[PDB]
Amino acid sequence: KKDISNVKSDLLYAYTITPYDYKDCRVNFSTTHTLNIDTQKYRGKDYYISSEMSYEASQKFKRDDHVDVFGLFYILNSHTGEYIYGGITPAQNNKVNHKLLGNLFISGESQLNNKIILEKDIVTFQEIDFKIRKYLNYKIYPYVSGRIEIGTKDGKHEQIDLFDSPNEGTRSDIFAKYKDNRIINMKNFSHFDIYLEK
């Protein structure tokens, strides 16, 4: 909550970030609370990504399971270790570019195709939300609030609150929603609708 004041700001601070896009890495060790990934061959000798996942998440991401990584961080320098929430999918093999179909609805009237391509057949919401949010051009954070609605082919829209920040809104507070490591196979991805309310 904490009305749109300090929200459209601690947001510009959170989502004006460079995401770790390390593709093809391996499970080095999984714990009931995390997943440790080999960032060497991207970072350097001794480097690792540390996904602090939910219990339901740790499950089957064990050693030598080459993974594709994409997430945001919540702090720096512990020198040879990087921290994010979720953002972990089986390693993509074949090269692909998935152009996404979508619409923007801003209240005044209001009637984005091919304007946000994805390159994984199994994508997390963290990557999808972040990419789209990035797109919003409309420099958001006259809009008091909004949300994204990802529609799957089997009618089961997903919601994402564009304007929020669990108090003390650190990147660690807002990105926690990416702890369940939720993902979507593109085959069951149809389109996305962005609703902005002024």
Please give the backbone phi and psi of residue 116, each rounded to the nearest 5 degrees, phi first: 165, 90
Which of a second copy, another protein, none has residue 191 at its interface (CB below 5 to 8 Å by kind)?
a second copy
- Residue 193, annotated ligand binder? yes
The least CB distance from residue 18 to another protein, in Å, is: 5
**Residue 168, interface with another protein (CB under 8 A)?**
yes
> Residue 49 or 150: which CB sits closer to another protein?
49
> Residue 75 or 144: which CB sits closer to another protein?
75
**Residue 139, interface with another protein (CB under 8 A)?**
no
- Residue 157, annotated ligand binder? yes
**Residue 179, interface with another protein (CB under 8 A)?**
no
Write out the binding residues for another protein, residues 59-88 only, by CB under 8 A.
73-79, 82-83
- Residue 191, annotated ligand binder? yes
Please check whether residue 8 is in contact with residue 163, taking contact to mean a CB–CB distance below 8 angstroms.
yes
Stretch that binds another protein, among 9-17, 25-33, 118-126, 190-198 (CB under 8 A): 9-17
> Residue 3 or 109: which CB sits closer to another protein?
3
* Site residues, another protein (CB under 8 A): 9-10, 12-14, 16-18, 73-79, 82-83, 168-173
- Binding-site residue numbers for Zn(2+) are 157, 191, 193
